[PDB]
Each structure stands twice: as structure tokens, then as C-alpha cells.
Amino acid sequence: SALGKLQDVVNQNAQALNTLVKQLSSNFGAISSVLNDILSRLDPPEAEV
Amino acid sequence: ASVYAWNRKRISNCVADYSVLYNSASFSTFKCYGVSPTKLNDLCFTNVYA
Amino acid sequence: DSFVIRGDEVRQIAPGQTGKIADYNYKLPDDFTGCVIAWNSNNLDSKVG
Hints:
part of a larger assembly; 3 chains; mainly alpha; about 60% helix; Spike protein S1 (chain B)
């Protein structure tokens, strides 16, 4: 644990990137989190929503 | 069947042409909810029930 | 734009509708602005034969 100050910054940046990548898996109230599924399932008036 | 004893039929292992359902004018209501009616020929499904 | 249709087909003169005269007779855009006007004309546009 001698080099914990640099490893803390590295872990925080990697964890922020992992959270930002993980946030793509959430649909945020939509029917799906995948854009291609929405674009292949729905007409543009509701796919727009 | 009547609505209290509604009949459930499984649909599986078939290729389905929904365009004969879209192009028929015999249906008074043809309303789809989770999918566009015109995209039904472009997708693959399982657990299809009538 | 004036035309004559059936009584059940008046729901298809609208943006974002799926239907028959919407596809092959008269299509409205998704960004359509204006008013659709419909009234019964059984006394004028109908014959007993």
C-alpha cells in the first residue's frame, strides 16, 4: 500500500469509465436498451419517443 | 371459445407471412403495441400464442 | 385536399397511422400541421341502386 495515491486515481478513473459503459445497459424507461432493437421493432413516431 | 374460457393455441416452428394480415381489409381493428405491424416480416419470434 | 372515403377509414387520415388508404391512397407526413375535416354525406354521395 505504499503507492496507494496513484492507484487511487487509476482506480477512480477506471471505475468512472466502467460506470459510463454500464449505463448503456439501462433502458431508462424505454422498451429496450438496444437502439437497433427499437429501430427494427417500431415505426418512427413511437421509435422517436 | 367464450371469453371466460378463451382458447390459447401455440404457434411454433413455422415461417409466418404477416403481410396477408396487414393487407386484408376484413379486420376492423389491427393494432400492435410492442412492435410495428410492417416490421413483423423482418423479425424472428418464439412463444407465439393466439 | 378533398376526397370521399368510408366511415371507418376516417381514423386513417392522421399522422403516424397504419392503414390502407394511408399507404396506397393518401399519406400524411409525421410533421403534418393543419386540420382534417369529416362529415357524413349519405344524403348526397349514395344511391339506392
